[PDB]
Design an enzyme around this catalytic site. Structure first.
Site, mmCIF file in Angstrom:
data_model
loop_
_atom_site.group_PDB
_atom_site.id
_atom_site.type_symbol
_atom_site.label_atom_id
_atom_site.label_comp_id
_atom_site.label_asym_id
_atom_site.label_seq_id
_atom_site.Cartn_x
_atom_site.Cartn_y
_atom_site.Cartn_z
ATOM 1 N N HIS A 40 28.169 43.508 41.698
ATOM 2 C CA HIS A 40 29.150 42.736 42.299
ATOM 3 C C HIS A 40 29.735 42.893 43.566
ATOM 4 C CE1 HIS A 40 32.657 44.788 40.713
ATOM 5 N NE2 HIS A 40 33.384 43.959 41.729
ATOM 6 N N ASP A 84 26.276 45.525 35.804
ATOM 7 C CA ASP A 84 26.646 45.788 37.103
ATOM 8 C C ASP A 84 26.356 46.930 37.804
ATOM 9 O OD1 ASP A 84 28.377 44.862 39.319
ATOM 10 O OD2 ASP A 84 30.158 45.405 38.165
ATOM 11 N N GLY A 175 39.494 46.404 44.612
ATOM 12 C CA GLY A 175 39.519 47.620 45.616
ATOM 13 C C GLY A 175 38.621 48.848 45.181
ATOM 14 N N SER A 177 36.275 48.621 43.132
ATOM 15 C CA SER A 177 34.967 48.284 42.410
ATOM 16 C C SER A 177 33.744 49.030 43.103
ATOM 17 C CB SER A 177 34.566 46.895 42.867
ATOM 18 O OG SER A 177 35.564 46.207 41.898
ATOM 19 N N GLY A 178 32.804 49.316 42.237
ATOM 20 C CA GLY A 178 31.841 50.139 42.469
ATOM 21 C C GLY A 178 31.960 51.721 42.653
HETATM 22 C C1 LIG Z 1 34.475 41.391 45.022
HETATM 23 C C2 LIG Z 1 34.388 40.709 43.539
HETATM 24 C C3 LIG Z 1 35.505 39.841 43.431
HETATM 25 C C4 LIG Z 1 35.243 38.592 44.424
HETATM 26 C C5 LIG Z 1 37.004 40.401 44.139
HETATM 27 C C6 LIG Z 1 38.147 39.584 43.465
HETATM 28 C C7 LIG Z 1 39.427 39.429 44.373
HETATM 29 N N1 LIG Z 1 40.204 38.534 43.728
HETATM 30 C C8 LIG Z 1 41.520 37.849 43.772
HETATM 31 C C9 LIG Z 1 42.626 39.157 43.790
HETATM 32 C C10 LIG Z 1 44.134 38.576 43.668
HETATM 33 C C11 LIG Z 1 44.907 39.582 42.742
HETATM 34 N N2 LIG Z 1 45.509 40.840 43.418
HETATM 35 N N3 LIG Z 1 39.420 38.484 42.346
HETATM 36 N N4 LIG Z 1 38.340 38.916 42.464
HETATM 37 N N5 LIG Z 1 37.026 41.803 43.437
HETATM 38 C C12 LIG Z 1 37.006 42.108 41.955
HETATM 39 C C13 LIG Z 1 37.181 43.319 41.987
HETATM 40 C C14 LIG Z 1 37.270 44.113 40.705
HETATM 41 O O1 LIG Z 1 38.558 43.955 39.998
HETATM 42 C C15 LIG Z 1 38.933 44.633 38.935
HETATM 43 C C16 LIG Z 1 38.773 45.969 38.616
HETATM 44 C C17 LIG Z 1 39.261 46.706 37.651
HETATM 45 C C18 LIG Z 1 40.396 46.146 37.133
HETATM 46 C C19 LIG Z 1 40.932 47.186 35.778
HETATM 47 N N6 LIG Z 1 41.773 46.645 34.840
HETATM 48 N N7 LIG Z 1 40.252 48.432 35.419
HETATM 49 C C20 LIG Z 1 40.718 44.996 37.177
HETATM 50 C C21 LIG Z 1 40.165 44.160 38.285
HETATM 51 O O2 LIG Z 1 40.656 42.992 38.466
HETATM 52 C C22 LIG Z 1 41.308 42.192 37.547
HETATM 53 N N8 LIG Z 1 37.583 43.697 43.162
HETATM 54 N N9 LIG Z 1 37.774 42.773 44.236
#
Ligand SMILES: CC[C@H](C)[C@@H](c1cn(CCCCN)nn1)n1cc(COc2ccc(C(=N)N)cc2OC)nn1
Ligand SMILES: [Ca+2]
Length: 223
Positions: A40, A84, A175, A177-178
């Site tokens: 993702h 993923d 932030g 992710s990956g």
């Molecule tokens: C690039 C994909 C996606 C489009 C984008 C993204 C950005 N927003 C809006 C944010 C507004 C609120 N600040 N929604 N999705 N995204 C998702 C993630 C992963 O997110 C999580 C990872 C881990 C955990 C964990 N509890 N361990 C939790 C995570 O999130 C719940 N990073 N960026």
């Protein structure tokens, strides 16, 4: 990373930042030429940034290499985030040094209770937005499957696992992710999803890298 700590300049030499005008995902260097990340995190035109600490200052040790290839796992499902995982080929090789070095793939799956290192430049606040200058680190155990599935009813597959803290406070976030989950010198997890960040009974979910070692190897050999 919420509730973590400053790693220190290049203490995590396999951590890369994925940049598309801005840092948007992490990744792990597994050889001089390839990066493991989350499916993702796919974008057109990713730039890979190795050797980074302060991602907002040119500090001397950084390497900047364009992604030439971006291979999403063929069974990836973006609705459930099962499988993923994504591989990124570097257009040129990384110069491996003490500041920039790869991370081993697992020979076998890790087990619940193992302690791991989670790192990245993601959000450091639950319920807010505060992204860090320098790379952050988290010490966190793999949790049991029963803990994971009771935290996330009907959502955890055989290719995911939970790690972190059921009490919350300490977790990965947007932030990261990956990014890597490293346990005993092996790359066992990829930062994947979670419900909120660092909230109670909502640990992080991670891609179970050990399920993919043969895929990674064949894919590197065919590209
Ligand atoms: C690039 C994909 C996606 C489009 C984008 C993204 C950005 N927003 C809006 C944010 C507004 C609120 N600040 N929604 N999705 N995204 C998702 C993630 C992963 O997110 C999580 C990872 C881990 C955990 C964990 N509890 N361990 C939790 C995570 O999130 C719940 N990073 N960026
Ligand atoms: Ca830098």
């Amino acid at each position: 990373i919420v509730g973590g700590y400053t790693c220190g300049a290049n203490t995590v030499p396999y951590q890369v930042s994925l940049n598309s005008g801005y840092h948007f995902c992490g990744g792990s260097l597994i050889n001089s030429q390839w990066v493991v990340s989350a499916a993702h995190c796919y974008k057109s035109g990713i730039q890979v940034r190795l050797g980074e600490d302060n991602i907002n200052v040119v500090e001397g040790n950084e390497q900047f290499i364009s992604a030439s290839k971006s291979i999403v796992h063929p069974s990836y499902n973006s609705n459930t985030l099962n499988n993923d995982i994504m591989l990124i080929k570097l257009k040129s090789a990384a110069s491996l040094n003490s500041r920039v070095a790869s991370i081993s793939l697992p020979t076998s799956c890790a087990s619940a209770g193992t302690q791991c290192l989670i790192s990245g430049w993601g959000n450091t606040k639950s319920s807010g937005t505060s992204y860090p200058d320098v790379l952050k680190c988290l010490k966190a155990p793999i949790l049991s499957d029963s803990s994971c599935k009771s935290a996330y009813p009907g959502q955890i597959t055989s290719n995911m696992f939970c790690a972190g803290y059921l009490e919350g406070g300490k977790d990965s976030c947007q932030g990261d992710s990956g990014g890597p989950v490293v346990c005993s010198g092996k790359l066992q997890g990829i930062v994947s999803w979670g419900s909120g960040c660092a909230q109670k009974n909502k640990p992080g979910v991670y891609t179970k890298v050990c399920n993919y070692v043969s895929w990674i190897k064949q894919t590197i050999a065919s590209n």
